[PDB]
Amino acid sequence: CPLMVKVLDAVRGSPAINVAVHVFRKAADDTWEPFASGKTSESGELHGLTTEEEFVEGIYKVEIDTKSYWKALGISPFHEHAEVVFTSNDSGPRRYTIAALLSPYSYSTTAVVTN
Amino acid sequence: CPLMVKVLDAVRGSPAINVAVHVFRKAADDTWEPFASGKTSESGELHGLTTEEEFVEGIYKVEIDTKSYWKALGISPFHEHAEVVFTSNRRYTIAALLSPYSYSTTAVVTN
Amino acid sequence: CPLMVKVLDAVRGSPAINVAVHVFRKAADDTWEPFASGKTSESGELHGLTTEEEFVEGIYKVEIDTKSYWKALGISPFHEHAEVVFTSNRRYTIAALLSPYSYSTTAVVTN
Amino acid sequence: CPLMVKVLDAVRGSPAINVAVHVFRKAADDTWEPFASGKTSESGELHGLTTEEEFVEGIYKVEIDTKSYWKALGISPFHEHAEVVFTSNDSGPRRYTIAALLSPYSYSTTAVVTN
Ligand SMILES: O=C(O)c1cc(-c2ccc(F)cc2F)ccc1O
Ligand SMILES: O=C(O)c1cc(-c2ccc(F)cc2F)ccc1O
Ligand SMILES: O=C(O)c1cc(-c2ccc(F)cc2F)ccc1O
């Protein structure tokens, strides 16, 4: 699988468990087409979103539902969600890990792109 | 004004200068309507995006055009942009820290 | 002055207020000699740590007392402090963003 | 092993490979005693630093040699290194992952403490 998503919690120092993640791909008319979704495991990781076959070059949006994560913990968050938007490229390395570190009023996201 | 945007370059340790920023507000038909736009100054700050009268309650999206920033500096980054989405109901400062394959964003909300 | 320290609270989305900061400078016998100290104001800023005359070349350590900050707010954090170590040879702004189990730190260096 | 260290590179979007990591523990006289060391693998991770037997409660410093990492890539860095200082606690969870995301003038560090 060429796309993995991992989410961590900076308040409790733990994986962010059961976080909904929605992936979209930009359609030719510039709207966002649903592409894949899931929820992070107990390790904070979401595997198996897609296959090499279906992960063609294009612009993708990964939406991490941070607001519902914080509310389910009883914590008031700022953002509606975390959005990661990128163009995949076949010339570059094969595997994309999208990682997000969450705080209630802040988040960081990084791409680890490897083979 | 009630909404300010600050952008820093983590590779250079400098303000991110000339960064375009587009603000959208979700419309009654839940599409993104253009709201305001501008670009950061030499301090990395974007002031005067809006007014207290116009910054009404709603769901806002601050799009920071990071890809155009890095490309103007001769670099091919990972992200298309950095999108900060929040509901407003007060001064908001939206801060972002940029690296070619990473960004961090924080909200500082005061009165 | 040539050295300023800014601290933000990522849980609250606010300046980190009353944060103690101790600056050290490596001595000729490579131990850490105390250099200056202070604490952040209501803006989360610490101005006036030193002067251009006293901020000579050297290896500096800015210790931000994050543990005491979180504990004063009733919270048990992970880190003892946040230590920023750098060589100087110009205004340095040392910025830190704090969560109970995480911190980020950036250097903004200008003239 | 109760202590793992992982390092990522935010400029290239990759693991930070071959980064020297030194761990110290505070001695009774308040000096830092060498405790363990290694270099990150090709996955950016450093396993096997210590055992449960030797990782007693105490104050530990993890020093990540970021400056040598950036210089070996030909990139001018700001910090001498990244320091993570914490008190381990036996009552809390069993495993400590110390993770650091590196940029030349910035770094982030987080603790993932699990079982
Ligand atoms: O920007 C981010 O998402 C980020 C991520 C990490 C991180 C990455 C991978 C991992 F297994 C653990 C981490 F803490 C550490 C710091 C950080 O800022
Ligand atoms: O999330 C962010 O936007 C962020 C911002 C800063 C930062 C903000 C303002 C400033 F003058 C200097 C900084 F390093 C530092 C770290 C960081 O993560
Ligand atoms: O590394 C940091 O210290 C850092 C700092 C900021 C930040 C700095 C200054 C400010 F006025 C607001 C901020 F969110 C935002 C993100 C960040 O990582």
Side-chain angles (χ1 to χ4, degrees):
Chain A
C1 176
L3 177 61
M4 200 261 284
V5 176
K6 186 188 177 142
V7 194
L8 297 176
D9 180 333
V11 170
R12 319 217 290 200
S14 74
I17 296 192
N18 206 28
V19 184
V21 177
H22 294 255
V23 188
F24 306 84
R25 185 162 73 221
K26 220 151 166 181
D29 68 348
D30 274 283
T31 69
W32 287 113
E33 295 325 82
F35 176 81
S37 64
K39 309 135 118 153
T40 59
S41 68
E42 70 59 28
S43 75
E45 294 171 358
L46 173 51
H47 302 266
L49 294 150
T50 193
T51 65
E52 253 146 33
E53 201 165 66
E54 241 200 281
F55 194 60
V56 298
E57 286 183 318
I59 306 184
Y60 290 84
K61 179 203 273 167
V62 179
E63 233 172 46
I64 307 182
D65 178 12
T66 62
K67 190 190 209 190
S68 306
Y69 174 73
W70 291 121
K71 302 206 271 173
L73 293 179
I75 291 159
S76 180
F78 181 75
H79 305 82
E80 289 300 298
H81 42 72
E83 286 187 1
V84 181
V85 181
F86 65 101
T87 299
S88 63
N89 273 324
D90 280 359
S91 150
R94 200 89 299 260
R95 305 217 191 91
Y96 296 79
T97 296
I98 304 304
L101 179 65
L102 309 186
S103 290
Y105 278 61
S106 182
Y107 67 90
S108 301
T109 188
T110 197
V112 186
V113 188
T114 61
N115 270 326
Chain B
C1 92
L3 169 67
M4 186 270 281
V5 179
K6 203 135 172 193
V7 189
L8 290 308
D9 182 324
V11 166
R12 263 169 200 81
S14 63
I17 271 174
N18 260 263
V19 176
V21 178
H22 293 254
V23 181
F24 305 84
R25 181 178 178 284
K26 246 206 226 163
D29 54 65
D30 87 343
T31 70
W32 286 111
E33 184 164 83
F35 181 80
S37 68
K39 71 206 263 193
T40 57
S41 63
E42 295 167 67
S43 63
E45 300 181 326
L46 172 44
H47 299 275
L49 271 167
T50 189
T51 65
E52 60 306 314
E53 247 176 75
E54 277 185 345
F55 192 56
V56 297
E57 289 186 308
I59 284 155
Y60 289 87
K61 169 150 72 179
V62 176
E63 222 155 56
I64 305 181
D65 294 333
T66 60
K67 168 142 188 160
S68 295
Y69 169 78
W70 289 115
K71 278 171 98 230
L73 302 171
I75 306 151
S76 289
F78 180 77
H79 298 90
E80 289 298 299
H81 27 71
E83 319 63 30
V84 185
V85 182
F86 68 97
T87 297
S88 90
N89 309 101
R90 227 152 254 126
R91 333 201 182 161
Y92 300 79
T93 285
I94 299 305
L97 174 73
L98 312 184
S99 310
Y101 279 69
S102 186
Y103 70 87
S104 297
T105 185
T106 313
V108 169
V109 184
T110 67
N111 287 264
Chain C
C1 92
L3 169 67
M4 186 270 281
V5 179
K6 203 135 172 193
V7 189
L8 290 308
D9 182 324
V11 166
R12 263 169 200 81
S14 63
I17 271 174
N18 260 263
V19 176
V21 178
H22 293 254
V23 181
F24 305 84
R25 181 178 178 284
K26 246 206 226 163
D29 54 65
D30 87 343
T31 70
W32 286 111
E33 184 164 83
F35 181 80
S37 68
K39 71 206 263 193
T40 57
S41 63
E42 295 167 67
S43 63
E45 300 181 326
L46 172 44
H47 299 275
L49 271 167
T50 189
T51 65
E52 60 306 314
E53 247 176 75
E54 277 185 345
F55 192 56
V56 297
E57 289 186 308
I59 284 155
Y60 289 87
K61 169 150 72 179
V62 176
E63 222 155 56
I64 305 181
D65 294 333
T66 60
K67 168 142 188 160
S68 295
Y69 169 78
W70 289 115
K71 278 171 98 230
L73 302 171
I75 306 151
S76 289
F78 180 77
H79 298 90
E80 289 298 299
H81 27 71
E83 319 63 30
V84 185
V85 182
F86 68 97
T87 297
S88 90
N89 309 101
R90 227 152 254 126
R91 333 201 182 161
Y92 300 79
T93 285
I94 299 305
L97 174 73
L98 312 184
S99 310
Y101 279 69
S102 186
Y103 70 87
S104 297
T105 185
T106 313
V108 169
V109 184
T110 67
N111 287 264
Chain D
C1 176
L3 177 61
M4 200 261 284
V5 176
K6 186 188 177 142
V7 194
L8 297 176
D9 180 333
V11 170
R12 319 217 290 200
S14 74
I17 296 192
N18 206 28
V19 184
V21 177
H22 294 255
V23 188
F24 306 84
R25 185 162 73 221
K26 220 151 166 181
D29 68 348
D30 274 283
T31 69
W32 287 113
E33 295 325 82
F35 176 81
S37 64
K39 309 135 118 153
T40 59
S41 68
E42 70 59 28
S43 75
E45 294 171 358
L46 173 51
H47 302 266
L49 294 150
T50 193
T51 65
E52 253 146 33
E53 201 165 66
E54 241 200 281
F55 194 60
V56 298
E57 286 183 318
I59 306 184
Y60 290 84
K61 179 203 273 167
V62 179
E63 233 172 46
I64 307 182
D65 178 12
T66 62
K67 190 190 209 190
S68 306
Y69 174 73
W70 291 121
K71 302 206 271 173
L73 293 179
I75 291 159
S76 180
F78 181 75
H79 305 82
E80 289 300 298
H81 42 72
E83 286 187 1
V84 181
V85 181
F86 65 101
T87 299
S88 63
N89 273 324
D90 280 359
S91 150
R94 200 89 299 260
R95 305 217 191 91
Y96 296 79
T97 296
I98 304 304
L101 179 65
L102 309 186
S103 290
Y105 278 61
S106 182
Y107 67 90
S108 301
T109 188
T110 197
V112 186
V113 188
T114 61
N115 270 326

